[PDB]
Amino acid sequence: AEITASLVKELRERTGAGMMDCKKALTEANGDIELAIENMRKSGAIKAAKKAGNVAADGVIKTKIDGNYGIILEVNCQTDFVAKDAGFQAFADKVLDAAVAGKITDVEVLKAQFEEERVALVAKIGENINIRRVAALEGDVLGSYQHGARIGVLVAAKGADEELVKHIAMHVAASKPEFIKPEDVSAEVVEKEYQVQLDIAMQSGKPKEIAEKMVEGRMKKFTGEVSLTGQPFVMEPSKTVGQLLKEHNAEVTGFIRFEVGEGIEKVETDFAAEVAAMSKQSHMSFERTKPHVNVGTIGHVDHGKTTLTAAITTVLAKTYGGNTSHVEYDTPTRHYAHVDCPGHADYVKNMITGAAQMDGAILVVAATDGPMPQTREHILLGRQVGVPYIIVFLNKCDMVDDEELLELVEMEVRELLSQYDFPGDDTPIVRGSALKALEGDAEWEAKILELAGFLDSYIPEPERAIDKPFLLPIEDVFSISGRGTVVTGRVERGIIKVGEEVEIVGIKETQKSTCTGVEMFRKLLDEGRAGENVGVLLRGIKREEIERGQVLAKPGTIKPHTKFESEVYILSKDEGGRHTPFFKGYRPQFYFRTTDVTGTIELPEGVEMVMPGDNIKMVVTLIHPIAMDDGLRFAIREGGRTVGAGVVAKVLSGASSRNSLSAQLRRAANTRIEVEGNLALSIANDLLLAYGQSPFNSEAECISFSPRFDGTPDDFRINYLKAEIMSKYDDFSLGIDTEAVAWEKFLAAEAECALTNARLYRPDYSEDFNFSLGESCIHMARRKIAKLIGDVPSVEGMLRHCRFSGGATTTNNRSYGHPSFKFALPQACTPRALKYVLALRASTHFDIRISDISPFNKAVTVPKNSKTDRCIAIEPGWNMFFQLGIGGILRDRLRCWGIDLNDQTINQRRAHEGSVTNNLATVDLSAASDSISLALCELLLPPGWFEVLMDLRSPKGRLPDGSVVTYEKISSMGNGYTFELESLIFASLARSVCEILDLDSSEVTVYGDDIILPSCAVPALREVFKYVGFTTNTKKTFSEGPFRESCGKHYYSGVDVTPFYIRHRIVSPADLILVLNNLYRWATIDGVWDPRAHSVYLKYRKLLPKQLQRNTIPDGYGDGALVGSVLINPFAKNRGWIRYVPVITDHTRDRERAELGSYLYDLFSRCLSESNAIDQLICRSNPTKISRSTGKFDIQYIACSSR
RNA sequence: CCCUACC
RNA sequence: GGGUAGGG
Ligand SMILES: Nc1ccn([C@@H]2O[C@H](COP(=O)(O)OP(=O)(O)OP(=O)(O)O)C[C@H]2O)c(=O)n1
Ligand SMILES: [Ca+2]
Ligand SMILES: [Ca+2]
């Protein structure tokens, strides 16, 4: 030590400067006060200027109004915590006040007027802080709005009143209008923006006056929207600000809106990979049940928070050897995840959103400085979020002589901790140095060790989910004959044993009962443990006495509540939340463990708008009760869209839409649009005419017209539509057309397999002399396939993939398709398939029974296009169960070849590229799956597999004639695996063809029979295919020309030319709406019409009942309303800040579900799962419900977003 | 279970 | 009938 302790303290208390900066400026002053205060004052700048190269993207905005003069101010800092800090508040509160009277606008004037004090803080704080901008606004009446501190606006308007200007100010803060009027936009920035779009359009091939008109309409919008005037007013999106003003005899002379940080990079920051980055410099020179603990580090930016967590990691690895960007380290007794808390808001967000909780914080302060002024806000954050314990790591202690000085810093911290109710006197404080720790220096190494010892002993072990009291969120209820009432769900915490009593609590008056049993799909059980999906059997209680959403718990452990206060986060436009703010009476859905429930909120004191993206405390009150205690997470929803997360803080005491309007629409909806002749045709023809193309001569021409594959994209697009649009229409009288042809087709395919079956089992030409491409590919493909697939389908493979889903089986019809009827009604099965069923039956205690054992499937017929139906096959139920098993497994394996059968999106893009690039082809086989013969499978597949495939197929088929077929092909369409099998067969060949040619196999991609490989490969692929029995569809395969198609998307030199189809007689208003919407989506660029089509759209829109002509919804909400602008829908009711619009839906009648079967289906599904930012983990999946379609329509109200 | 869009 | 994506 040099000079004395209490000499430095009073140097701090009158300055706020760092400890060592105080001692060291007290030596060069020979123990003199005033002399010292000066060496620092006179060095205030050396510090500040050292911080210039520190990005200050945070801060506050302030705002003041004087009679009718107003100023808006922005002064940055680099941190959340500094912005809410008292001192920094006072600087900006002052630089603002004294900037009012002294009416300034030149940012430099008031800057330099404060520069000598701007250095005061920057020294005392340790963050770059400085005035960023200022501006001034005056008018006849101006008003301001302050959205916390992140954003303020000043609004000046003539002829307006008090609240009006507030509201306008608030709107401005929400909608960011970059001008005050549509006619105020830089007639240059625009006149040259109209000069860029004109190509985008005229290069797509569009005729002069079309590209123009389009661009004009676009630009008219492009502006109206970025202009206060043509902006849907925020407090009533139905009318815009423009109209709001006009009807108040007012206008807006001008406005300013500032937002903290606007246009300042705000350099990204990754925590983990930075620690490893600081760990790298000294990178140089069983018991799995261990408890899991979350810790957060919190303190001043460069007080060494990052170096400490580096230290904590090396040292811990060196010694005890071994969500979202978070380092993790181990102690001999527990396992840690560690986050940084660089921002206050940002942290509160993650704490609500569950993306990062905290069992204890670690407050980091460098002893060379001591607590900073903003250290208050650090501890305060801890306090506000309820971090249960806070440990202190004094850092950089080695850069300190007097040890009495550390005794002194440590006092300051303890006193701060206690000012915020933390155990100041009893809280751990390790005197350490992270730097030396990383230099291996074992003196300062045992302090890190010591810190982790406190982590192990001061932050108490968190409560293992099993040790808390039983609770199971009820997902569904079943009435099971001779086994009472049963609920299913995942037990959330605790254990339930048979015999114990339970309460069922939530939505109605709480009820009591006792546990009869506990079952999973395979085992029956006497206890259910936390994390397990189960059924639990209750006694005396009935199934209409229990609802989903209730919980099952140990008695008295959980109680039902209706009112509570909470901390919630509203998602932004980004995260898929709302895109408009809400206000006083927000009335959304609060989803709890498994169900939505309506609630109203009240905002805290003095807040009256809420924007996507921000935090808020609100007092929520629910329509009826839900079991809850403190801590319980919940989502916030609007029509099943997630717009917020929440956490109950404290439970409290808890002491639009029109009917005739629905009736009007219902009546209209059940009306018949009726016209003469064929409406579909008339529409197509008015369309052909508006694009100036010759109309369809007759019904005959609709289905026999071929497009010219040339001319401009525009010319081709309507030409392609002409060829496709009527091609699947099912109501053509004119034609002895049929489905007789579908069977001929079907018989042709079989006979084809018969030939190639003969051939492939006979290729003894008895002459090696000759070598063949097809032979070669089969050999190569076989070898690749085995490497991918294995000798045989894994048992686990089957365990996670066999399932029932869907439609008809050989015993169930469309009506009894649902999986719950498959578990209830006995299913048929094949003699060869029997052992699978028995094995499944040996596998569970539930009954598993076989209607009948027979080798037949049912060949039926389903619609395809105007020219032919498609023959498929309805399988035996149990065979299906297992087919989907192997089908599911092949789907997984095929990923290793880059083939992803869940994503037809990758095939569409390669179609599009092949379209400009001509380097890729799209190809198509004719009877794709009807042509895979038995022989081909047998040559390609491992024996183990082919056998399993032979057991599971239907060997025989019963046609509608009662006649039979003994199948030549391996499997028919409608089998559980044929799609995935044809994909693998197709890919394996194309890949082998690639290697034979020295192309990259990886360029191959396949989805069913939509095959995409490199163009040069096609001729050889054609030959292989011909050889192994397939016939390639010359008409729908493209390896040159400007055209490509794959998976629904059609492209022409890069432009989307995918058509649309009218399939049915248009008879109801839903039929017509669907067609019109398809027209809309095909003719609209971003909501703007091609004029050619729009004239036809408007012509036919007049055929609808009047109210249905105006009842519009945004795109992506379905087709029970015309797509258009929902803001101008007269029937849209804005109810509680969420907007509700009526759509047409099919009127259903409820049917009785199969109680046992539904319960198996539920349980079986939970089995399937066990073998398998983000608050999506807050929602489940829903209860079995059956319903008949009556032929009528209903009106349903759905939630919408302005869009 | 009932609608639309595709293989 | 099988699968995909979206909707109730
Ligand atoms: N409604 C459909 C459509 C396709 N697929 C499956 O996807 C593959 C694609 O067959 P398509 O290309 O649609 O037509 P193909 O049966 O091969 O007959 P074609 O091209 O001559 O019309 C084959 C089949 O397994 C299906 O099962 N059911
Ligand atoms: Ca095909
Ligand atoms: Ca195809």
GROMACS .gro file of C-alpha atoms (C1' of nucleotides) in nm, chain A residues 818 1010 1061 1063 1119 1146 1187, chain B:
model
   14
  818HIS     CA    1  -6.018  -4.227  -3.861
 1010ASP     CA    2  -4.093  -3.645  -5.992
 1061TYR     CA    3  -5.767  -2.587  -6.237
 1063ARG     CA    4  -6.242  -2.925  -6.143
 1119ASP     CA    5  -6.145  -1.986  -4.935
 1146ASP     CA    6  -6.898  -2.684  -4.459
 1187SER     CA    7  -6.845  -3.548  -3.795
 1204C      C1'    8  -6.373  -3.716  -3.919
 1205C      C1'    9  -6.476  -3.258  -4.293
 1206C      C1'   10  -6.269  -2.865  -4.647
 1207U      C1'   11  -5.869  -2.668  -5.032
 1208A      C1'   12  -5.327  -2.718  -5.296
 1209C      C1'   13  -4.989  -3.093  -5.504
 1210C      C1'   14  -4.698  -3.645  -5.601
   0.00000   0.00000   0.00000
